Ligand binder design. Structure first.
Ligand SMILES: [Zn+2]
Ligand SMILES: [Zn+2]
Ligand SMILES: [Zn+2]
Ligand SMILES: [Zn+2]
Ligand SMILES: [Zn+2]
Lengths: 258, 380, 322, 38, 115, 179
DNA sequence: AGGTAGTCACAGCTGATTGCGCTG
């Protein structure tokens, strides 16, 4: 009766993968997608009751991605490949927006988990976790929405795991620490599949038995309301708790309340 | 006339048939009506607050040995005080709690006014095994509280909570003058009695703007403390009320890097045993002092070290999500897939956001308004 | 109008009296005779009858016919009764108007969710031989005074006193109750004690932390002003009275509370307990069977050794009411 | 007596419903009463 | 909040003034001497104990520290607005139970009420 | 402890007796070109089986994830509870207390709004330097003699450097304000 | 071989007797 749900969020930012292809490195977006598909196939292999969802995080929007091989796995992989092809080929850069919409993808993942939980029969409990692989740099403009998503995930007891590839993200560290998930930075990109199978494949009950890397140094720098940048020391209002980098005689947020 | 002396109600007349079997449609309507039982707000009360400098005064007289509350008044009072401190610090991020114990016609400042919950809980646990003797002195406790809170900034709400078990208090001077001074100092005094109503407590609560209540049982005591947890309403804008506080990132040290520098914790330095010389923790952004617990004000430079998620957890109150426009399924000439869960829309009502004009089902609408507090479409 | 104060019942708007006084078959008091003469000479609106279950009696049925009233309202909590005379109440007063749903009533939180328990205690070998040897009504005291049931009752009393729970211990067969209450040194109501002693005991039972457990012998089998209680432990009740069990349960509701029934295995009390709970299971209550009490040997209980247990046979066989 | 206590405890604690329930245990909270949860 | 009567207040039978009135009422109005003395005692007790209730919101505790008050011939002389509040439960209770009753009453009388 | 602190600051000429009790009382269109190139490259995409993982990569990952690896470091302050004996740990705690008190005085003096505080901050910096020379340098020499692997002095050095940098920045601001 | 009126236990009520208290 143990139903495990694994929603995998893939950072599909075209600019970062294009730069990676320009670097002519051994790791590309195709290999990352293959590793994600193999991890999902393994998750479905572990038990009948396991459910899988793959969400691709893109600049324009968030896309729900999902011969000797398993029949259900074959259809799932074909659907994932078709969806990722449709997303990438029709992805036209129209605007100066470059930061990935990670917060929206996590919100959609939470909504999908909420939908799945109701459809789960009352005799079974659907344990849900969200795995995020990070490719591009962190986005500071989405601080409030990301924190709201973290709090929503914590309220429903949903694990959030981050698998950072190149550049660390403070928001992902905070999400992993608050929701109880694991934060891991991959040293060798081609070993992404092995890292996922070794670390993020087991469930939280299985994570208790297995010895896993200790949590990384999570930062808690706040975002200034008028600058939206990381700060160490800032002015915080006493009424609305809004954070400001510099002293002001009249709080901007308190202006709303007359 | 009387409501029940007229005609007997027939509640079963609601259901009707036209095609012999529309009861399925009626029960579908009933099931749809069962949902949306909330007002799309978890609290629905005070959406804001203010910095509170609350002082808790605990009676330490012989009356605390009474067994009205098992096992005695002191133990139940201290347990409920630990619960109150935990809940108050949970619902108030930058608040401070002070504890004063009055005994033998004198008042002892058990704990300094600060924002550390662990210190207050430890002090209460230590005070569990105190000696209950003498008579309480409301005058001395109020004098200590007023002396401490007179220099506090005006924008903070200064509050005193008094747990008065004994019905008699010894005052070295006139107490009504002290009440007038407290009223002039805008210090709110609230009293929770245990035995019966005392006139001085009622006068003090009425004049200082607080509330005076008398305990019926332990459940009523907990209810009164929980009511005292809630912050008071805050005025629109008084002055330039701000505060210099830091956000110490939890930088732990790893020996894999060459910058793994062990350091003793300032909070643990005052302990009798060996202080925790852990690899890392919370380093002060101003003077690089090391602390383990948060929120703890820095001992060296005086900077207030707070946790950003704690402050951000209340941000959804400032910007609540507007209710989506309820639209029947037939009248919506657009996509029939929910934007949040990708599920097929088969319910009679479809909710559309006012900003992005997206499609949300009933379950996703409830989840967004109750828990997410943000529209997924508006984020993009 | 109960021949105690005589608060001038003549010329009154609302008159409150009791049964067994309006249907006297013997000579009546002069003041009472005049009051009855006045009361039988005018119409009554809404003659309220309390404890309507005991209406179909030899002398209580004539009470309805001895006075004239327009509306007859019957109020009760336990409408069950033996001798199948409840059907007679359909024409004696009227049809069953309202029957409260106890499960949904306790779901709303306005009725205490009582956790019913049916815990049995094995018969000691020294007692079971005498139980099976005698059959002429002398076996009632044998399974009532079971040492194992005594230990179970003492353990329950001590456990619920350690957590400050008000306990009402119902016990018929007052002969057993005498040695049951003095052994624990706790207050008990023999029943014909006085009027004042019972009132003061029930008054100091509630607003006193030192004493929180009392013993009742068939006196609390009606509607009284007993204070709020959480624990009920009944031992040796009547034969198959579903009414008595329902009334005793009603003294607890007002898992907020829980009530226990102690029976002796391989005795008639087993069948009595089985047949007296069919009203409560119809009301929706489930009686969990408790076979072992946790920490029975953890602390010291009475009748620890076999010497006093076998000595108890001498005193329990000493009735000899022949 | 020392042996009387043990004999009485053995007889009382395990008379009918223990010589078989314990055998099953050897071979193999909401609804639990407060004294059964301590 | 509490009015305590230490014993039944009986007027001094000496000075040969009260006894003359007792004899006059005995031989003129057929008034029993014991009845008149009890009436005077209970009248004074009720007069001095009923001054703690002035106003609807006002409340007070009334005790009678004498077993002689428990007898019916003296309780019946109390005003009717006190008789119904004097339940038969507390007529001879000891000091400890009287204190417990006072505690319960005072605790339950401190809660807010309506108009 | 206070008497020991008094001796270490007054007898050793770190601070004067008067001062002791005074305080106590992105790119160009090349990015679009890269986006077009990656779009064209991923337009013709097929799943792979052999290239997903290799024996060498899996072995390296297991070595990293095995105890004692980069991510699963096993040392990580093995016996610091017993390393650098508590006699030195007591001295380190005393040094921490002294540094904390001196920096508390410094940060209480800051910000400098009156000319009187300017001399006080200079005297505080001189006291900090004297305390460092008196205690930390022999402490560092003792640590080097014992060859302790822990960088205990590093935190004190960081705090002193932060205080000195703050004071230097404030002095630079003060000089510029007078220009 | 089967079934109903006495009968016992335990409680209630009301109707009288009958036995102790009844002034500073
Ligand atoms: Zn700013
Ligand atoms: Zn503000
Ligand atoms: Zn600091
Ligand atoms: Zn939806
Ligand atoms: Zn929207």
């Amino acid at each position: 009766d143990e139903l495990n749900l694994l929603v995998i969020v893939v950072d599909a930012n075209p600019i970062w993968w294009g730069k990676q292809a320009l670097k002519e490195s051994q790791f590309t977006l195709s290999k990352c997608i293959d590793a994600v598909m193999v991890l999902g196939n393994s998750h479905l292999f572990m038990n009948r009751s396991n459910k899988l969802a793959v969400i691709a995080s893109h600049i324009q929007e968030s896309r729900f991605l999902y011969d000797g091989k398993y029949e259900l796995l074959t259809s799932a992989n074909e659907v994932i490949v078709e969806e990722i092809k449709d997303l990438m080929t029709k992805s036209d850069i129209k605007g100066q927006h470059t930061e990935t919409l990670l917060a929206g993808s996590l919100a959609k993942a939470l909504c999908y988990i909420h939908r799945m939980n109701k459809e789960v029969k009352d005799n079974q409990e659907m344990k849900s976790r969200i795995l995020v692989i990070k490719a591009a740099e962190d986005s500071a403009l989405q601080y409030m929405n990301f924190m709201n998503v973290i709090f929503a995930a914590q309220k429903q007891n949903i694990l959030i795991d981050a698998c950072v590839l190149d550049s660390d993200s403070g928001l992902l560290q905070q999400a992993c620490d608050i929701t109880g998930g694991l934060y891991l930075k991959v040293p060798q990109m081609p070993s992404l599949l092995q890292y996922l199978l070794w670390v993020f494949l087991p469930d939280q009950d299985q994570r208790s038995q297995l010895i896993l890397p200790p949590p990384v140094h999570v930062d808690y720098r706040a975002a200034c309301f008028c600058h939206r940048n990381l700060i160490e020391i800032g002015y915080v209002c006493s009424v609305c708790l809004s954070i400001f980098c510099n002293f002001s005689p009249i709080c901007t947020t308190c202006e709303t309340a007359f | 006339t009387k409501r029940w002396e007229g005609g007997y109600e027939r509640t079963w007349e609601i259901l009707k048939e036209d095609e012999s079997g529309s009861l399925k449609a009626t029960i579908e309507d009933i099931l749809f009506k069962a949902k949306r039982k909330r007002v799309f707000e978890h609290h629905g009360q005070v959406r804001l607050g203010m910095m509170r400098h609350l002082y808790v005064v605990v009676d330490g007289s012989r009356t605390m040995e009474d067994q009205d509350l098992k096992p005695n008044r002191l133990t139940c009072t201290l347990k409920l005080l630990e619960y109150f401190v935990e809940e108050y610090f949970d619902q108030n991020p930058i608040s401070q709690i002070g504890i004063i114990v009055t005994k033998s016609k004198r008042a002892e400042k058990l704990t300094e006014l600060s924002g550390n919950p662990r210190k207050h809980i430890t002090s209460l646990k230590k005070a569990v095994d105190m000696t209950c003797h003498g008579e309480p002195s409301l005058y001395n406790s109020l004098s200590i509280a007023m002396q401490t809170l007179k220099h506090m900034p005006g924008h903070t709400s200064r509050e005193v909570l008094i747990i008065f078990s004994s019905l008699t208090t010894c005052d070295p001077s006139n107490i009504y003058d002290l009440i007038k001074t407290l009223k002039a100092a805008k210090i709110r005094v609230s009293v929770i009695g245990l035995s019966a109503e005392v006139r001085v407590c009622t006068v003090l609560a009425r004049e200082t703007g607080g509330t005076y209540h008398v305990i019926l049982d332990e459940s009523h005591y907990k209810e009164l403390l929980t009511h005292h947890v809630s912050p008071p309403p805050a005025s629109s804008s008084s002055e330039c009320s701000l505060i210099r506080m830091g956000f110490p990132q939890h930088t732990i040290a790893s020996l894999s890097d060459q910058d793994a520098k062990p350091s003793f914790s300032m909070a643990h330095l005052d302990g009798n045993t060996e202080p925790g010389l852990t690899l890392g923790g919370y380093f002060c952004p101003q003077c690089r002092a090391k602390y383990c617990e948060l929120p703890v004000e820095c001992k060296i430079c005086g900077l207030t070290l707070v946790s950003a998620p704690h402050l951000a957890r209340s941000y959804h109150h400032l910007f609540p999500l507007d209710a989506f426009q309820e639209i029947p399924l037939e009248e919506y000439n657009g996509e029939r897939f929910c934007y949040g869960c990708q599920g097929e829309l088969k319910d009679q009502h479809v909710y559309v956001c006012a900003v992005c004009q997206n499609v949300f089902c009933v379950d996703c609408d409830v989840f967004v308004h109750d828990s997410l507090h943000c529209c997924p479409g508006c984020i993009h | 109008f109960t021949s105690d104060a005589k608060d001038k019942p003549i010329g009154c708007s609302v008159a409150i009296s009791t049964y067994s006084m309006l249907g006297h078959t013997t000579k009546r008091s002069w003041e009472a005779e005049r009051v009855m003469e006045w009361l039988k000479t005018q119409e009554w609106g809404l003659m309220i009858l309390d404890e309507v279950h005991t209406i179909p009696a030899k002398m209580f049925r004539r009470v309805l016919t001895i006075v004239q009233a327009h509306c007859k309202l019957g109020l009760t909590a336990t409408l069950v009764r033996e001798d199948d005379k409840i059907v007679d109440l359909n024409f004696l007063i009227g049809p069953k108007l309202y029957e409260a749903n106890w499960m949904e009533l306790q779901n709303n939180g306005y009725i205490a969710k009582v956790q019913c328990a049916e815990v049995w205690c094995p018969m000691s070998p020294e007692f079971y031989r005498e139980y099976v040897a005698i059959k002429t009504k002398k076996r009632i005291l044998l399974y009532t005074m079971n040492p194992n049931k005594f230990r179970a009752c003492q353990f329950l009393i001590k456990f619920h006193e350690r957590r400050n729970d008000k306990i009402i211990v119902f016990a018929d067969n007052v002969f057993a109750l005498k040695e049951y209450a003095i052994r624990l040194n706790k207050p008990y109501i023999y029943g014909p004690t006085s009027q004042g002693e019972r009132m003061q005991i029930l008054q100091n039972f509630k607003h006193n932390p030192k004493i929180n457990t009392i013993f009742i012998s068939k006196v609390g089998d009606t509607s009284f002003d007993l204070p709020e209680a959480n624990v009920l432990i009944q031992i040796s009740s009547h034969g198959g009275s579903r009414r008595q069990e329902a009334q005793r349960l009603g003294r607890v509701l007002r898992y907020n509370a829980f009530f226990y029934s102690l029976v002796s295995q391989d005795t008639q009390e087993m069948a009595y307990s089985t047949k007296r709970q069919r009203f409560l299971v119809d009301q929706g209550y489930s009686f969990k069977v408790i076979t072992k009490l946790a920490g029975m040997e953890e602390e010291d209980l009475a009748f620890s050794t076999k010497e006093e247990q076998q000595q108890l046979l001498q005193k329990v066989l000493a009735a000899t009411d022949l | 007596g020392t042996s009387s206590q043990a004999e009485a405890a053995r007889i009382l604690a395990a008379s009918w419903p223990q010589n078989r329930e314990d055998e099953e245990k050897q071979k193999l909270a909401s609804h639990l009463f407060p004294f059964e949860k301590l | 909040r509490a009015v305590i009567m230490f014993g039944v207040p009986y007027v001094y039978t000496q000075s040969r003034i009260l006894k003359a009135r007792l004899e006059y009422l005995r031989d003129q109005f057929q008034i029993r001497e014991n009845d008149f003395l009890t009436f005077d005692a209970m009248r004074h007790a009720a007069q001095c104990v009923g001054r703690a209730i002035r106003g609807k919101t006002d409340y007070g505790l009334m005790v009678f520290a004498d077993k002689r008050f428990a007898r019916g011939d003296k309780r019946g002389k109390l005003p009717r607005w006190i008789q119904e509040h004097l339940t038969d439960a507390n007529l001879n209770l000891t000091v400890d139970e009287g204190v417990q009753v006072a505690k319960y009453f005072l605790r339950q009388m401190a809660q807010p009420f309506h108009r | 402890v206070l008497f020991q602190l008094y001796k270490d600051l007054v007898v050793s000429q770190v601070i004067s007796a008067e001062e002791f009790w005074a305080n106590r009382l992105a790119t160009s269109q090349d990015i679009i070109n890269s986006f077009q190139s990656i779009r064209q490259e991923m337009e013709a995409y097929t799943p792979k089986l052999t290239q997903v993982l290799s024996s060498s990569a899996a072995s390296s990952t297991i070595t990293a994830l095995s105890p004692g690896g980069a991510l699963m470091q096993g040392g990580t302050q093995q016996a610091i509870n017993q390393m650098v004996p508590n006699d030195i740990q007591s001295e380190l705690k005393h040094l921490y207390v002294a540094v904390g008190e001196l920096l508390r005085h410094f940060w209480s003096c800051f910000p400098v709004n009156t000319p009187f505080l300017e001399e006080k901050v200079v005297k505080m910096k001189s006291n900090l330097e004297r305390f460092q020379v008196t205690k930390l340098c022999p402490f560092q020499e003792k640590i080097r003699r014992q060859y302790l692997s822990t960088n205990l002095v590093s935190h004190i050095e960081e705090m002193l450097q932060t205080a000195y940098n703050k004071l230097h920045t404030w002095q630079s601001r003060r000089l510029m304000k007078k220009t």
